[PDB]
């Protein structure tokens, strides 16, 4: 007879209910299971009725794989899922958090902290739009973004993933969501999931909640704050996310007052689901349920019970799916987890899948492949990088000539520093590899290449990675541009109690600026100890992690555009002051939140 769930003209809620009523326990638990492409095979996907796949950081089909290679991979998995009895399409997720950043040749946008510097939500919406297109270029339908953490301590390894220490700025930047997913209809019910169709992707507000509030910025640790503080600082942007129809929410590894977020029924069910009326699906973080226990994974049976009873809908396993499925099945057969809980998880997963059009377009569109790295998107990334730059100093004394903007025509100029010609360094973490990497890892333009592309043909450009003082004094240079800063990092590898840049960095700046007027470009995920760099430099720019389009930097250095970025975080005098945020009783910054010098276009 007629099968209502397969009928594209029927309302989503009717299709969900029709399909849910047909499913076995195995088919239901399958929908709740998300696995790594690394453990996926056609038989695994078919036999376990798997609901979702992901690529973790650096999980790619081949080094340098084309958009088509990605589409073929995703479609191979989909074909297996579509061959099950009910033919429920899988959804494939990835960390597309500054562009489609795992993919070779994808446009890499500035990381979130630099976007916060722009104070430009429409720019961020446009970045969401371009990112959706590059993700769909690779056949992927689901991006684990935006990170709406409000980072309250820059010692956190993920501080660069947070738009600001100020929740109001994070709130405004939730415009990423309708960029990724499309604008919701007039009349939209807050908390319903939304994706416009096959040219958009499902978004994910993460990581719920207080991931940016942990003690001493220790990643995955305890956020110790009263309910009023949680609701005033860490929660607000989730409500903007509900209003904008975010499709999914990912749970944080962190704890709130000692309770694991992955086990917190009060917040996940009581608050997110029952108060905010969230109707999309709630996903774990990677091995998030394993980490409820200490040691992690020491009581996986408890991990499954605690997380599923808390209200999580989809588990990012991501590897040991057999153990997950077996344990969850046993809990349901034993009456420990009720069928109502399973039915709720599956209703939410199917709701997102039907809403986004996945049953109508389960396969990739080969005509989208050319969206990857498209020049228009690179032009956008270049605009964003330029807008993100914060000018901290432009002259050593109030009476010096301003150094910036620099002249494009000069006899001889010097470009120097470990970050001047290093694409990997300028992109930072979550670029190609999970932790990012060094050197030419993708298609882009380094600061050195941007300088050579910008200057008059008569300008001789000399590159020296780490010149000594005599080299500079003898070189006959008009000025120097020196780029230094942090190496790429992600998650706990970025936790850092000293916040001092690696050497050589300061030593290079001192050698260069001691011999010729210099503009220092600081590449970092966060404020770092900066007084010695300032003391040496004529001009200093905080460029954050500007991504693949290094011409964004030189657009401002050479005065094609004026500097406009403003600090989205407090710049501390000393790490012993931390945590120290705008509005604090004792607020003694080196530069306040909102500080930024300006220039005018030449
Ligand atoms: C402030 O605190 C931070 C965080 O705790 C700390 O930085 C970390 O230091 C660790 C050692 O103390 C280091 O762990 C080791 O890393 C070895 C390899 O490290 C290189 O490659 C990784 C990526 O694979 C980078 O992240 C590192 O920055 C480092 O990169 C190299 O750095 C040199 C010097 O600038 C450069 O010339 C190279 O080109 C560059 N290489 C690359 C590929 O980019 C590893 O093999 C060891 O087994 C060990 O695990 C850890 O990586 C680092 N984390 C970072 C930077 O995010 C600071 O202390 C050190 O800084 C490093 C760079 C080094 O110079 C140490 O001697 C410093 O003490 C702390 N600062 C202080 C205490 O003043
Ligand atoms: C030389 O540089 C000056 C400093 O940048 C610049 O004056 C600024 O111009 C900008 C852009 O027009 C002004 O921003 C606006 O401020 C409004 C009032 O609050 C906002 O409602 C606007 O939205 C806009 O704010 C920006 O929105 C985007 C976001 O990303 C930014 O962070 C945010 O600032 C800004 O207030 C001016 N600042 C000051 C101190 O005056 C000069 O531009 C002048 O000439 C033109 C371009 C015109 O816009 C004038 O109003 C402006 O004063 C610039 N001079 C020249 C000759 O180019
Ligand atoms: C926040 O971070 C702190 C610091 O990492 C966490 O405390 C640490 O927890 C680990 C257990 O995961 C402890 O390691 C264990 O130590 C015992 C010795 O007592 C040893 O026998 C075990 O094999 C294991 O290595 C570690 O000592 C401990 N450190 C401190 C200073 O307490 C803390 O649990 C984190 N909090 C949250 C909510 O995540
Ligand atoms: O080390 C590889 C894996 O580690 C995980 O903890 C990261 O979150 C994944 O993105 C990554 O694929
Ligand atoms: O790679 C999937 C997930 O891995 C986790 O380790 C990170 O915390 C998330 O930000 C990421 O989306």
Numbering used by the authors: 1 to 602
Authors' text:
HvExoI releases a single Glc from non-reducing termini of oligo- and polymeric β-d-glucosides to support seed germination and plant development. HvExoI folds in an (α/β)8 barrel (domain 1) and an (α/β)6 sandwich (domain 2) that at their interface cradle a 13 Å-deep pocket- or crater-shaped active site. We discover that through chemical signalling, the incoming substrate evokes the formation of an autonomous and transient lateral cavity that serves as a conduit for the Glc product displacement from the active site.
Here, we capitalise on the Glc product entrapment observation in native HvExoI isolated from seedlings, which renders it an archetype model to examine product/substrate dissociations/associations in a pocket-shaped active site. When we first described the HvExoI structure, we were unable to explain why the trapped Glc product remained bound in the active site and has not diffused away, and what was the implication of this unassuming observation. When we first detected the Glc product entrapment in native HvExoI, we hypothesised that the role of Glc may be linked to the pre-organised state of the active site to maintain efficient catalysis required for the growth of a plant embryo.
